[PDB]
């Protein structure tokens, strides 16, 4: 299949009493108790639209920057995506200053490359504090710039666990003219995505199946095998 | 208190005048009398006097309508606009 | 059907319509209800035909007891209304009228003014062509 | 205020309401206008409410 409705089984409900009303236009008529439940058919339609749209964008020799910044679950599974499909991954969101100022990513990636070279070229003269400085510089420039740590190419598309979760992601997204697609919740402002994906992320199955479907969409545009919507089994893994 | 139901039903000639001009003007006149009695018994109740003047004004406008629409309002005028 | 949120006499049909139109423009709202009148029906039909406004439905309870009209604005699939500004002309405190030869094209020669005349209600262009003038109900562009 | 039969324990539970009533009387032992009195009293009340809510 392709973006099967079988995955659309637990994409309902989040933290209540906090929700953007304009999501009720895009999700469903939500009760006074802030019922964060999502519809199935409209969510599936929008998810399939995003799927094949990012597929056709990545078939144009583009890039889908996979961003993972939630507690541990989204980040770990985005790293699994990166090790499954050749796409960039986020351990920690870049603090801003990547796209509109291209020099600021180039300096970081070059610094990390030279840091790796220095770590692999000399370790006898270094002291414990000097080695800690070197490792901390590596860690800093890897987390101060997650999507740009060894590559200089400008991403042609980026996702995020929540388009209101990351200010820098939105800034470097709206800097470019790209179809930004993101996992959107009820507490999220819908005005920061191209195709809204109204679905849950507090439920771990929901978000992991969603971003795995995104991984399959980018992989089928990269001519490599795809697993979800092609295997009927839904993943069961609690949100680490 | 309000002195509502008895005065209404006395002014309620039929089942077709529960909220007519007749019952309204009767209520305003009865309220003017009751408010005069109250405010003479209760001097510094400025709420009562301001309400009395408001009812006097609304009664004046109700009477001007009742003479604009029906010409028999002043042929049996027991509600002359003078107060 | 079920038409909700009735409105009573605010002070006039024209301002009652204008406040709803501007509130719909503000809150990105789709369909709003207002009073019903022959002039309102004429202007609403002509605005449906003009393209600035989407359709409307005139409703009654049984008679003059209650006559209202619900009306929707034409929206693309982006929550963008077709209404880019509507100004009421006929007002209670100011009864405004113009001859057939003194009616301008609004926007940049594109906007269409709605004009009632001695023998009917029509658009500004055909009002000039009709050689008959009268009151103006709404400048629409 | 009266807390009896204990030298320190009932006296310890005494002193709280004792000073409460003493301050309640103290803020009534000087002439002042309703303005500042009510403004400060309600400012403290809203401080306590926001600390509570």
């Amino acid at each position: 299949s392709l973006a099967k409705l079988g995955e659309m089984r637990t994409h309902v409900g989040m933290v209540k009493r906090y929700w953007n009303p304009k999501m009720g236009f895009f999700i469903e008529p939500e009760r006074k108790h802030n019922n964060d439940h999502f519809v199935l058919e409209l969510q599936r339609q929008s998810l399939q639209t995003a799927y094949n749209y990012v597929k056709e964008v990545a078939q144009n020799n583009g890039q889908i920057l996979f961003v993972g910044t939630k507690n541990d679950y989204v980040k770990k599974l985005v790293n699994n995506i990166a090790k499954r499909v050749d796409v960039a991954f986020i351990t920690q969101r870049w603090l801003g200053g990547t796209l509109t100022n291209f020099k600021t990513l180039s300096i970081s990636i070059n610094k990390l490359n030279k840091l790796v070279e220095k770590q692999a070229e000399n370790a006898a003269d270094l002291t414990k504090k000097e080695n800690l400085m070197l490792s901390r510089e590596i860690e800093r420039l890897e987390k101060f710039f997650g999507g740009v740590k060894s590559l200089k190419r400008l991403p042609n598309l980026l996702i995020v666990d929540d388009p209101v979760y990351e200010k820098n992601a939105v800034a470097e997204a709206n800097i470019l003219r790209i179809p930004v697609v993101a996992l959107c919740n009820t507490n999220t402002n819908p005005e920061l995505v191209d195709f809204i994906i109204p679905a849950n992320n507090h439920q771990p199955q929901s978000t992991c199946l969603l971003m795995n479907l995104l991984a399959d969409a980018v992989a089928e545009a990269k001519a490599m095998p795809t697993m979800f919507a092609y295997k009927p089994d839904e993943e069961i893994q609690i949100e680490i | 208190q309000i002195d509502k139901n008895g005065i209404i039903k006395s002014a309620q000639l039929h089942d077709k005048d529960v909220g007519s001009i007749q019952v309204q003007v009767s209520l305003l006149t009865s309220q003017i009398k009751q408010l005069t009695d109250h405010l003479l018994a209760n001097k510094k109740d400025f709420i009562s006097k301001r309400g009395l003047y408001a009812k006097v004004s609304k009664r004046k406008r109700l009477l001007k309508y009742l003479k604009h629409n029906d010409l028999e309002a002043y042929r049996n005028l027991v509600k002359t606009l003078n107060l | 059907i079920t038409t909700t949120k009735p409105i009573k006499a605010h002070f006039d049909p024209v301002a009652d319509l204008l406040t709803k139109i501007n509130n719909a423009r503000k809150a990105k709202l789709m369909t709003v209800t207002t009073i019903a009148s022959k002039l309102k029906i004429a202007i609403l039909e002509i605005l449906v035909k003009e393209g600035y406004l989407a359709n409307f439905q005139v409703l009654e309870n049984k008679s003059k007891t209650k006559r209202i009209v619900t009306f929707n604005l034409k929206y693309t699939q982006r929550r963008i209304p077709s209404i880019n500004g509507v100004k009421q002309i006929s007002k209670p405190g100011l009864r405004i009228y113009r001859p057939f030869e003194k009616l301008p094209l609004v926007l940049n020669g594109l906007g269409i003014a709605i004009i009632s005349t001695s023998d009917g209600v029509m658009t500004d262009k055909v009002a000039r062509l009709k050689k008959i003038g009268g009151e103006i109900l709404a400048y629409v562009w | 205020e009266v807390k009896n039969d204990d030298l320190e324990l009932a006296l310890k539970k005494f002193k709280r309401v004792s000073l409460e009533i003493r301050r309640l009387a103290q803020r009534h032992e000087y002439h002042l206008r309703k303005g500042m009195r009510l403004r400060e009293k309600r400012k403290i009340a809203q401080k306590k409410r926001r600390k509570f809510r």
Binding site: - | - | - | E1, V2, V17, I21, K48, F52
Partner: protein
């Protein structure tokens, strides 16, 4: 925390319900505020007027500490 209209009768005089009133009372001439017993406007009226009424009839210390 609401107290009246659940243990009270919605009609509070001094007799037959004086214990619910004395619950916001002490022999010290004080009434528990909303921070301890968050009763609504009518229940606060109940407790205030009725307790100072019992003080007024010489049932509980009017001001006495």
């Amino acid at each position: 925390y609401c107290r009246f209209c659940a243990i009270g009768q919605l009609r509070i005089d001094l007799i037959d319900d004086l214990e619910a009133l004395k619950r916001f009372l002490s022999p010290y001439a004080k009434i528990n505020p909303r921070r301890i017993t968050g009763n609504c406007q009518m229940h606060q009226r109940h407790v205030a007027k009725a307790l100072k009424r019992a003080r007024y009839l010489a049932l509980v210390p009017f001001v006495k500490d």
